[PDB]
From Swiss-Prot:
Residues bound to substrate: 64-67, 122, 139-140, 193-194, 244
Superkingdom field: Eukaryota
Catalytic residues identified in the record: 266 (proton donor/acceptor)
Part of the full-length chain shown: 113 to 416 of 416
Native organism: Sus scrofa
Boundaries of every Peptidase M14 domain copy: 6-300
Protein's UniProt name: Carboxypeptidase B
Gene coding for it: CPB1
Positions with a binding annotation for Zn(2+): 64, 67, 192
EC id: 3.4.17.2
Keywords for the protein's UniProt record, in alphabetical order: Carboxypeptidase, Cytoplasmic vesicle, Disulfide bond, Hydrolase, Metal-binding, Metalloprotease, Protease, Secreted, Signal, Zinc, Zymogen
Cysteines joined through disulfide linkages: 61-74, 133-156, 147-161
GO BP annotations listed: proteolysis
A Gene Ontology molecular function term of the record: zinc ion binding
Major subcellular location class: secreted
Cellular component aspect of the GO annotation: cytoplasmic vesicle; extracellular space
Amino acid sequence: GHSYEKYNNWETIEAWTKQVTSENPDLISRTAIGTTFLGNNIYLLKVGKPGPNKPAIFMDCGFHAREWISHAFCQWFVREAVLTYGYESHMTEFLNKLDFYVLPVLNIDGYIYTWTKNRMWRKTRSTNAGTTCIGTDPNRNFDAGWCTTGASTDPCDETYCGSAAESEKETKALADFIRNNLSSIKAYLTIHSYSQMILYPYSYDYKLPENNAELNNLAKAAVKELATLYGTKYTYGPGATTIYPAAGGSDDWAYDQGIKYSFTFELRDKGRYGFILPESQIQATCEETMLAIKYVTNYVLGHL
Ligand SMILES: CCCn1cnc(C[C@H](CCCN)C(=O)O)c1
Ligand SMILES: [Zn+2]
Ligand SMILES: [Zn+2]
């Protein structure tokens, strides 16, 4: 059975994508945007009250298999949408005016692998020529400074960028969906863990986006909002001044497509538990993260 306060295996998440859709037909529709290396359907939930020509926000979770709190967060976001639509002013305004494309688990194959064999798996589960080493880092596989600094050319590395940009079925599917819906997607949010940061572009080169000042003040404000609940401390900034290079990211790629609000969220903790964040922190982590995501959503809605 599914629980929003526990980590759910893929079979349970997949069943939940179907059930949450059938239980909430006037707010949610489900599609499959492609299949993974292992043939699993990559489900996408479109959350919002259907209406003519609505702007959208795209959010994905589970790029990196071991970052289980990310997968939990996408599910919590849907939980919140369903639960509070009609019961709280902001969420119902959000669902009435915007559509949210929520991709709960991008790297399904890796996620399954973290449940069956290796809790610390990160990459996809595709095969690489000339080696028995498996997988490509999906967040080094986008066409954004592809395979430059911070992305490894070695297939045995955790940061391998793949044989080519969009070599992975999962990243090709995501990129295809975004390119096909570029005129409506106004923001791109990608959920990861750990380290408690809100990043924005650029991580493939030492350069700053043209709307750097705007993104910095929004990230700063979202960090402040997140902290109000439990005092959790996040850092933020463009990759260029905040982290070491990490070329081939989807945030940078989405931004270079023209999606001006493109953010990577790295959730709890700061390293005590790292990727193995206890289930007892799911609720609090998701609740505080909701405050930042809603802050960003509200901002986007006011900046259309
Ligand atoms: C200990 C935290 C490590 N961690 C895990 N996941 C991430 C997300 C970044 C995003 C980089 C900007 N595209 C990355 O893919 O490197 C960081
Ligand atoms: Zn990650
Ligand atoms: Zn709540």
